[model samples]
Target: LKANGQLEVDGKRYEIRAADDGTISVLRPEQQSKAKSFFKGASQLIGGSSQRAQIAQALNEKVASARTVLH
Candidate 1:
């Protein structure tokens, strides 16, 4: 929603509307340049909810087994 009542996907869409709050949903645009990043897994991660680099480092650690892998 913008000041002009248009739903701009960054600088993409011309106009979009919703019948209601629930009728108006969210979606991630394709992996395109300058567009907003979309989250597609698990639950919503807002603000500093995720430690990305630390998570990558932990996942890269040596694995022991299918269920007992160490990170």
Candidate 2:
């Protein structure tokens, strides 16, 4: 466990650690939520890459089909 800094996961502060593979098991909840929400909002308008248009088109088709099946 490689220490990065002090962090609060649930309610108590913990000594943050990064594994050799470079991932932390206990994430900062507030930080994770903010990052996820921010990215999700960004993805709505612009999902990046040169092939983003193709990716979005494929995704939209799948989504429409799923909605139809659900209804």
Candidate 3:
């Protein structure tokens, strides 16, 4: 993460930024819809003992795919 609210993943850049009102933007224009689906699944696994691990894995998978597109 950066002071300007950008995030780096798999050697690529993304905006994992929150606005002053505390709203966050986790994807760029091209990946928003895919992120929606990924996050939807992540949300469904929210009540388990391994929820954080599952979510992190989900996010890592998504970022890996997204990094391929950048390459």
- Pick the lDDT winner: 3
**Is candidate 1 or 3 superior in TM-score?**
3
lDDT for model 1 comes to: 0.44
Descending-lDDT candidate ranking: 3, 2, 1
Q: List the residue pairs that clash in candidate 1.
A: none
Worst 10-residue lDDT window, candidate 3: 18-27
Runs of candidate 1 with Cα error greater than 4 angstroms are 1-31, 35-45, 63-71
Error of 1 at 38 (Å): 6.4
Clashes of each: 0, 0, 0
lDDT, residue 53, model 3: 76
Could you give the candidate ranking by TM-score, starting with the highest? 3, 2, 1
Worst 10 residues of 2 by lDDT: 18-27
Of the two candidates 1 and 2, the one with more favorable TM-score, higher being better, is 2
lDDT head-to-head 1 vs 3, winner: 3
